[PDB]
Amino acid sequence: KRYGEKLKEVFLMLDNNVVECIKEITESSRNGKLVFFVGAGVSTLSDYPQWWRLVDKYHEELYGSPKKGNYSSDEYLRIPQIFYNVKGEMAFDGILKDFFQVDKPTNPIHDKILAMNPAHVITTNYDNLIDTACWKRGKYFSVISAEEDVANATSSRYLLKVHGDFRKGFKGENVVLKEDDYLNYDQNYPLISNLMKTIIATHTIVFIGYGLGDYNINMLLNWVRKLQKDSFHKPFFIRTDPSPIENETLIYYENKGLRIIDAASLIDSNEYDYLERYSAVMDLLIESQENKFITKDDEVIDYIYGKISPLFALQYIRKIDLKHVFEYDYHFEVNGTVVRHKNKGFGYMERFFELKESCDERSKLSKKQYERFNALFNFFEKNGVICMAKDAGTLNTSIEINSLAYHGKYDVMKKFIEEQSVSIEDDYKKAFFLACLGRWEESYDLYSNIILNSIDESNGCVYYLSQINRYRIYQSITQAVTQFNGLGLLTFGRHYKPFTDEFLARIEREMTNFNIDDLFNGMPFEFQKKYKILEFLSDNQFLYDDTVKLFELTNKVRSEMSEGSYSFGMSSDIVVLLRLYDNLRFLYENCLWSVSFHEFHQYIRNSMSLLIEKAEYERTRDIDELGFSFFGKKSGFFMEYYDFVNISRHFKIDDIKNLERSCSIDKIRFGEQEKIEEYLVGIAEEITKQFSANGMNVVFYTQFISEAKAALYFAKYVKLSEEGLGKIVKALLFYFPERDLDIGKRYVWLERLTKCNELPKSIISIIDDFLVLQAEKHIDQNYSEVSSNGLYSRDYGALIKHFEKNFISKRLSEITLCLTQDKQKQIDFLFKLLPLLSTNAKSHLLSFKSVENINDLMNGIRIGLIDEFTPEHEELIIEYLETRKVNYIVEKEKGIQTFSSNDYMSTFGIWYFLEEINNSKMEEFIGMDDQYDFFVDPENFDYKKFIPSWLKNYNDKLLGKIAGNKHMKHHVIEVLKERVKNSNDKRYLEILMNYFI
Amino acid sequence: YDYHFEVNGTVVRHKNKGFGYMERFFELKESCDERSKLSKKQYERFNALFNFFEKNGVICMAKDAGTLNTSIEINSLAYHGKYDVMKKFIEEQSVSIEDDYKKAFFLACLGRWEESYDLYSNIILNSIDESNGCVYYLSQINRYRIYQSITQAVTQFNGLGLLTFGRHYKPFTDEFLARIEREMTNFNIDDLFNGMPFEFQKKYKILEFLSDNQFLYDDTVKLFELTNKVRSEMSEGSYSFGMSSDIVVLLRLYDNLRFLYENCLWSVSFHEFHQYIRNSMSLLIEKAEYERTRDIDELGFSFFGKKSGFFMEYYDFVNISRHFKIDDIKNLERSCSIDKIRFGEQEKIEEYLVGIAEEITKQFSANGMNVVFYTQFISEAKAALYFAKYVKLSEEGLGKIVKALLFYFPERDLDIGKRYVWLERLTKCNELPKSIISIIDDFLVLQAEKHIDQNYSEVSSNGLYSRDYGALIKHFEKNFISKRLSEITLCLTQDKQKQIDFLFKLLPLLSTNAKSHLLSFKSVENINDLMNGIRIGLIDEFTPEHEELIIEYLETRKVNYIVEKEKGIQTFSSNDYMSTFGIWYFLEEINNSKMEEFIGMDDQYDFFVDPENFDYKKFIPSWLKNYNDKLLGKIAGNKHMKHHVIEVLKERVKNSNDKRYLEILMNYFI
Amino acid sequence: TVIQDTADVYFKRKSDGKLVFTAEAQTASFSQAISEEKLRGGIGNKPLYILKSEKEINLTVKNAFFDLEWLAMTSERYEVEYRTIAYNPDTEEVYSDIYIQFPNVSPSGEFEMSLENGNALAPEIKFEALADTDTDEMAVVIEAS
Amino acid sequence: TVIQDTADVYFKRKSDGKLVFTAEAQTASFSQAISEEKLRGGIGNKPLYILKSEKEINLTVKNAFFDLEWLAMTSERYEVEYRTIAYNPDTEEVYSDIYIQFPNVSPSGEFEMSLENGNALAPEIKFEALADTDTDEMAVVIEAS
């Protein structure tokens, strides 16, 4: 328990040389290059049999008794050879089996040795204890004990059991024990030595379990000496003799090229405290594996400058992973509060902030440290690191800044692309901007050019972002080509191919069998160490943790909704908001292309959906008396320009509809309405420029027009200036791609824009020009008015009349005067706009044509020309229903369908129900449609055929009549209340509370 | 990635230019001549592959396939929680390293985590030389998993454990904790698969996601986006055909459960997996409720035969019990009406509930219980208890579950109020048989026995004491009295005045002799005692003494209010009494005009007593939930208040979407 | 167990009798909400009443395979031939099939520009039932005994 | 601009008044309804009206700490002193402060061996406000002004 405390006392009492050596061993350990020469000393801790035991056994067998005297290093080897020769090899093998064949257990040192991620472990021991020691920790190793094992090298990590081992068998022939084997090693094992030399060459040997004068230590010493001067780092020696090392021996083996450490020099120990000594040194090194070298708080600025200065490269980094720079020592929370997670030393980070508060303390530093703190504080401010969590006062988080790519700017983008690229960062920005503009091929080639130039200048950050961007844009090119060749032909009728097939072959060739997931792994150890934050970008499964954060926080927020619980401090929605703006600022400031990918859009979309969902609930949240006691008049959720552009960019129009339906957006007031209007004016103008000119980059068009559609659709709430309204409408009607927005979507978007801001006479002129163009599109008989939302230019004219009580479009009137009988299609079109033309034009068209069939009758009544139903009109209705009846009895043997006739028949049923047409024949046609029976004769009609669409789709006057009739009023109220009780719906509740009860 | 294996039970032909060999393999499966022609060893390979694909649910190509099916086969003992069976297998001797793996996983679920770690190690020694890469790796995985679990359990013990348990427990020894913190220190589970022999990773790339410390991240994001698709489907009123997102999350959840339970990964028990299961189910059931309440549109029902309705199977019950907390199931029942869902496998769910009750009875009947296993199983026990309402139980099963709930359940983790409300939830489905009435009478008489001591007092978060239990007993048995409590009265003395007060609340469950004893030994002259006498039925009218006592209490509260004007105002608990009294006056129960003088409190006191002078803008519609049908009618009938209440209620319900507010407005239509 | 009437959709060129691509239907969305003159603002007189309701049909499919001839050769209009079996609750399996067709449709999928990382093979394509003045809706349902 | 109710909570021994642990409030939950009881008991006395509504106050505190003495020394009752500035509509923060206190509470935490693999330090402890026959609940509010 307190062993760690006493050993930490030993640390920082250690001579600087020892601590620096320990840190070097740790750093090489992390690099997977550190190698260990573990000797019998470590195995002695296991009580493994010692060679002198077999030596004495051999002496007894030879001369009938032991030596009763110390064996020299030559004797330790010589007596075994005398036994091997005088007697033979058989009893040699027998004695090896008798002694070394033991299942000794490993000890703490055996696993500590493995805690350093040994690249290799070259052991001269003949034991199999060291093999198990490797599994103990988990490191894999390949055992080598002969020439043949040199082939069997499955891994990059070697347990080079040099001098042989009894794994072959307990035989002297299978090991190096007798003197001759030691002398003839260079000839007996060419290949083990072959490996041995190379591994010793570059890897950081660290000696342990050995005596300084050990024969194997001396062999390795001479072998490292054979290397070129200054071409080998001094390996280390974890010496653990109970006696303190003689200074002269220390000087000798430090000169020889070994970085030696004595446990006895670090601690005090007994004579048989071998395990204690090994543990002391190894555990000092292990505690160094954790950063505990933070000496004093006044030194803080140097430490933070070591950690943060290389980090200036990014234009911003997320505070989520800024903790990873300090290895989870200080968690930088989303709001900026720096939560202290761990700090072995005092003033690890907190002293930096106390300096930030106390300016006088900040004055105590050298101007070097002063400006160091200055730069680091500027970096933290860029990060939004508000204050240390412990002393953090009242906070006021704000919208994170984003780059111009986040803004709806494309003219600036092209200007800068035209402008000369000053340096590598300029070219990286140019590549991202070209990618944004749809010039994906130019961006890709520039990315490759900067790949070359960036490894040339050694900008690891810029190169690595360029690599990941190049892969991401290549994926975009490939998927775009697939989309084109697969579906664009069905879309346009003739698939384009902006990307040349040779270019696609080239880009596919340059990158094959290459996963960006391994891109960070393939980087230099320097870059990997100083840029561990950018590892998150390596994995192709982007947003590898932001999605989980969103999932958990969405759950929590829904739970808060359902529980109806108050909150104090920042809540779940606050952290969702903070993470969202952190991710946006990071990705757009760094100019990564990964934003355009679907997954990032989905993450942004879900976050904003949850944010607005909780925004709606807090508005209608009820407050208890104690709820009011804790807090009252809480801050409302806002919709700034930045949040608008999020909604526009990341949501689809169906998603915006879904969220508007679920949540009343109009209530939550919008912010930066002027900036919103300017950005919408920008979208409109860009569309005008792109569509008026024939030039329409197809990839760019697909990339951005979704943005414009969403912004136009979601612009229903924001106010626009008069000139802005002119621009936005002129974009919406004429220059908008007709392929995506049919006439109906066009009309309803214009109607929403009307709903917030009125259309002045200028906009009236714009829409009149659009209508006269539709007339000029109607000169050809082949032209057809066709929409998905059942909305036509007649509805546009209805809007103009709704705005202008009196409006005579002289263009339409002149057209009608110019129209002749042969232009009957144009006569029909101008008829739909009959209210909008002059009196003379009305008379002209009335002369040209009048009602003759049901379709023309519905046309006329929609225009309102006929103010009363003639007997001919009702008789025409009777004839049409006679046709429908014969068709239905004919269709009775078939399946019966009604999708357009049903509209006319429902209107006729309505008119019977409204006692407008007394005709009793429409009663005779009862039985065909459920709604027809419901209207013509509700009492006979069984009220089980009532549809939910009927329950919610309605008319005000029709609802009044329904309430007025009691027979259908009972049934309809019953089913409607039943449905709202089943599923609470706003329309159902309104229909309940307003017309019947 | 040669062929995408679709979760539905088929396989899609991912882009490949090979031999079309899954197509060929399913032609072999289809054609008896094709399979017969193979070499005999090849035929054995073919049929073993067929059996494997059946085991994993793979049938044929997605294109070749047609109608499919979904079901549950997570048959792990830990999944069922047969702890008796689980430890019986553990003590039974192992004959394989996979047997040792099974024992180690079981020891982990039983709280004998020390034995689990030791057995894991043992398998590692048994497999390092024999080179069983899959078993070796997986045992290392779960060894790290248990080291995590034990670390978190110990950390909980050192911290919140003191306040929660009320004591400092150290179930794990310091030496063992240090031994295991050291034996595999500085060890990344992510790098394990990377550092494992190449042969094993090549053969079992499946286990890469196991290597990842944040395993099931892909599962998490997949569920999250499928949930997004589900919510969009709910919003837009779509009508899906074939598989939908909800079916996809169902199958993914079920597959992950089955995988991690049959492989016996101890990672199954972590909270991240529990969170994934909870979310997956929650989506399934909210989808089921939304499907129940949906328009017709005369197109969806026609295509498919009849309709596929949602139901609850024994496995569904197991998952929900294991992976939900009481707040989860309660929030669920609130948002979605589980009662609409028709449960299934009632007998097997009964068996599982009896197993849960048997386990906790074994734990708490005996003084000795493993603390770590108690934490592991109590939450599951609580969820199964609360979730047992919706299933039919037999008389023996009902007796066991109820006796668990009352006597064998901890008081610390579940107070008396929860105990009672959980009981009354349980009986809604199963009316109290003589056995359950006897069990409640027994537990109640024990409460009386603890109340014999003057130091003891009943404690309940919900304010639901022994009186509520007795009320339930006489609710289901209109004629019932406890002989034990009667003979307590026979020995009862005025010294045990607190016992007399406790028993005063339980008057109707006693004999006439006991009623006389209660009447004689003490009076009903106190506000709380008056409420008790009203509740138990001893007093029905307010005598001059009773009304004067209430008037004196209101005088004390009035002087306190006057002092409170000068020294701050506190109003939580008294206002309850004053509101009750104002209603009594409003309901023509109290007639004294002294109360009109006491007016001045703005929660149901000045309102009910003086509706006209009351400022109706302060009225809160949530007050309407507390009133019953009689008081609802009276309050609605009074002209001085009806207009304001209807306007506030209707506007607030139209802004809101509470069903109870709809019901209150429906009774308010007048 | 699951829906046993897998839908075969045939999407053909309308001008000429050529098949473009066949797929498997995934979901169909129907909306009947009044958006003409938004909610209120339509033509209204004392004796005159016009049903102003407007509706839109959306359909999704999956596993799109295009005819080789249509790729080879490559105002234009297309049709749909949604093909499913009519199943009653009484008869969950019926020899008779239900035939749904949208002779007027417009191909406009939001999957265009979907650039998801890693594996992807769900080219869901959206369609909108395009309408005309003469015929409010072109969809038709016929059941073949 | 953030919600300025950074309340300070002092958890003290009700038996002796000794401070146990201090922390910052996170959330507070209020739920009140009527017990699901009967009205036919005996004769369902009409004159005998009765208020049977029961309410539970659930709470949560974050950044839970502890006192050295309380750790040192180790029916029992506990006290809570919610200290909050008197936010009122007139001013972002009023000179006066609002004291909220619950003399009776029990520490039934939701933690229950939460074994989340995450390295997050949020020992959230839940609190259910206990009741007694004499008092519906001890929830107390005072105004400094």
UniProtKB/TrEMBL annotation, chains C, D:
Full protein name: Uncharacterized protein
The organism of origin for this protein: Bacillus subtilis
